[model samples]
Target: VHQVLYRALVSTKWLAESVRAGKVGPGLRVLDASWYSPGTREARKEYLERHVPGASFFDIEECRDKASPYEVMLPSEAGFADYVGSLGISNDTHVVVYDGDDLGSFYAPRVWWMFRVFGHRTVSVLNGGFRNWLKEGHPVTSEPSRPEPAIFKATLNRSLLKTYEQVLENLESKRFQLVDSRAQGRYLGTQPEPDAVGLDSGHIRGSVNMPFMNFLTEDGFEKSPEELRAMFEAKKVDLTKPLIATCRKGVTACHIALAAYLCGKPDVAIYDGSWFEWFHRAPPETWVSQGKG
Candidate 1:
């Protein structure tokens, strides 16, 4: 039996060695999961221009549920299995994901969580993402490698996901602590959100704001465990309680979950519908908890 080690976050140096050793393929898979969108450039275009050696682009846009009305949602179990299988991600592949962000730990966690929620425990986020890889001046390549399709079976971990109904139930039971990873203004409805988000700007009832980017250091690496521990304490989020996260489309929401995972609370759940679906379905009062109404 193979003795498994910590796969939550892998260092850039670790990946460089793997690339140098040519150990990326069926056993190891490196993925660029960046989602900066039109802000800077499309993630796919960036990946095509330059990326980590043997890295493939894991675009969640293709992995998202097509039937959902929201902007983004996890795909069905069968849908994910087939899609990832085509990516050559077998059940046991060691998937390492990173974003093209200078700020470290950006949208990469979404794909990292995606891999985990789909029953693939053999996954990790590249610590600092491509930013750190580039910072170290490691090898880069534009020639993407195509792996042969492999059979992949994914089982959705029911406990790791939250539905809009579950979120409403929590409003009455107050069981799980809700964290909003959107910016302060958006959470407060002071800034405008895109029309695609289904609401101008606002957050759900009883949610605390902790803009996702705050979870990482300037150099694109996650903060120390104790450092993150203190950060959550200041936000009034009790570390021992059950935690759920949300954002514009449940994309950035995973950042909260990832940060909590690093802080010794690995059982973080995601509200896949997030603010987009919540704004359209939840009571109007739920949107103005910050006194913006």
Candidate 2:
């Protein structure tokens, strides 16, 4: 049961065997969705240097709502479908995403959630990302793979994406539990924020804090489903209720959403604008740092 619950995460051994059997080459779209933090090296250059055989690069910065003034907003369904089609992916393709920056970077899960949000549920993230793939001695290549473009249509899953207005409504009605994946210092309003957007450090009112790293093992693999469920329960997060996850920008919120999905909470949604949008515009009374809900 636990193994089935972890369908969103794939092991290196399993993926390697699938590749060896040629099951992942034609119908599967393996994406190197690697991303680093603001001051870090570019993930595309790293992918171009070396990556899993048959893996195509997925750029997080480029595949966004370009017109939005906020960072990391999701693009329109049609736009997303076209962008993914350019990557040689279609509705029938099994998409596997992996990051080169270990599990610390949320890009793999971000892309996985993006596919799900766009109504493509045939998606999974590499368990330990590229680091574990290399540790297991899987073959890597610098040569890129180019496949014929396939028609991909996207149906937007609006429930998986939440806006700031919805979050404000929830703040008043308490209809959904807000879970934050930022660091403890940021959540507690005690540490200096690198991306506070001119607002004081603190989480949304009545939100609970669960650092994103809690869902990952030391070697960058996802924790077991049982462990994931326990982590949320320990933090007073009711998995049975509606949930909305947020982080500094919009990236790590997907990490929480993925973790919740592993815990059998598929209805979880991401607050896309997240603190970056809220902090700059929300009313002063809507921010708090001393409580859990």
Candidate 3:
């Protein structure tokens, strides 16, 4: 069945065939989970131009922690429930998420992780993103889809979320190994962050750097499980231990969580505040960087 087939990922070929068969509806939902940084191509505008047929746009910016000054933080459980409900998503809905980024996927994993955090396990990231879909000649549409709204109740798995204070404590306790998924330069403080937000680029103490892009192929599809396992082994990230992933903000960090999931460690936690909160709140000595030393 497509449900089991769409566990963690769904290929463009499978999704395109499903679209052709008109299977998307209350039971199955397709979302364009595309996003870009400041001064880049607007995601909504791009979706307006073209997207997967029977797909609705999911704006992380719109469905975020509105009270937080930080970027792309998780919304409240009720906020999430209401927002997804308006999108015609029910608890049982199987969501297929994809992005249109040139590298294949950027935030598709983020959205997929978000769904899982909200206790919606029936979701998958569309492998290769929209880039592969276009490359494979999958039919797209400018026509808008108006799915009938369905009730969606969200239950947050708080254990899956790590906080600033908890992360601070972990520095001393070493309870959970921190995994920084930002670029090597950013993690090393060799380059400035895209959104410094009045802070320098650096990683948390005792954290290992694992650039999120490393988990994906040139075309954006996630690498094979064997390859992913090798990556964890290469990083010395014990697949059996507790791990928490963080990035500049929080978006790309989910890639680490997803990669870990693919490696049979699906309980990986995420530091939602990530470097954004750590940079501003923690003592300067806590920021690990080559330049500082």
The most accurate candidate by TM-score is 3
lDDT of 3 by residue, 1-293 (tens): 11232369898989988888889998889999888878888999899889898899998988998889787899999998888888899998999999988988888889998988888889999989999999988888899889999999888888778999999999999989899999999899888888445578878889999999999888678999999999999999999999999997788999998888877788888999999888878998887887864
lDDT, residue 179, candidate 3: 95
TM-score of 2: 0.93
Clash-forming residue pairs, model 3: none
Query: In model 1, where is the ten-residue run with the lowest total lDDT?
Result: 1-10
Residue 201 alpha-carbon offset, candidate 1, angstroms: 1.1
For all candidates in order, the CA lDDT equals: 0.84, 0.84, 0.88
Clash count of each predicted structure:
2, 0, 0
Best by lDDT: 3
lDDT of 1 by residue, 1-293 (tens): 11243458999999999989989989998888877655666888889998888888888778888888887799888898898888788997998888887677667888888877887888899898888888889999888679888889988887889999999999889999999999898899888786463366888878889998888887778888898899899999998999899888888888888788877687788998988888888889656844466
Native-to-model Cα distance after best TM-score fit, residue 234 in candidate 1, in Å: 1.3
Candidate 1 root-mean-square deviation in Å = 2.4
